[PDB]
DNA sequence: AAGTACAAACTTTCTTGTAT
DNA sequence: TATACAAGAAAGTTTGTACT
């Protein structure tokens, strides 16, 4: 899902999610919710993409 | 300017606004919006660019 | 301590209807 | 016909707190 990939990219990165923010430039709380699935389409979503390093579709569709 | 270059498209690509909507699967509303600097992160920015058929970096940064 | 959640108030982006 | 405006709501963001 958007937010399950996120969680798992997250960790083979080792951020926590307060760092993981750190580097899209938002709060902790943002990338959370998104995790958790209580946001499907975070205004950040080309933000995220760049840290995690993935590309957004694969984000997105988990291609 | 993130709408200019939208704009500057879709006159391209012969559509007009409705047309690259209903293809975007938005709305000609949503269209201006975003077009007419109301809008700067849309939910569609990747279903767009595809449409588009440039880059969503290229969106904002037109980069 | 450290890190992950929660929930309310506010903000942007969407949606529908009509005006130009 | 094709682009624009405008009011209500929803989807996201915030920020302060709370859990564990």
């Known amino acids: 899902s958007i937010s399950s990939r996120v969680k798992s990219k997250r960790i083979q990165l080792g951020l926590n999610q307060a760092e993981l923010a750190q ?3 938002t ?3 943002s990338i959370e919710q998104l995790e ?3 946001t499907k389409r ?3 979503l080309p933000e995220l993409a760049s840290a995690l390093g993935v590309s ?4 997105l ?3």
């Not at 957004?56 to 984000?59: A, S």
């Open 23 to 25: 580097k899209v430039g």
């Open 42 to 44: 975070p205004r950040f």
């Open 36 to 38: 958790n699935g209580k």
């Open 61 to 63: 569709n988990g291609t």
């Open 27 to 29: 709060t902790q709380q």
């Open 56 to 59: 957004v579709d694969w984000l």
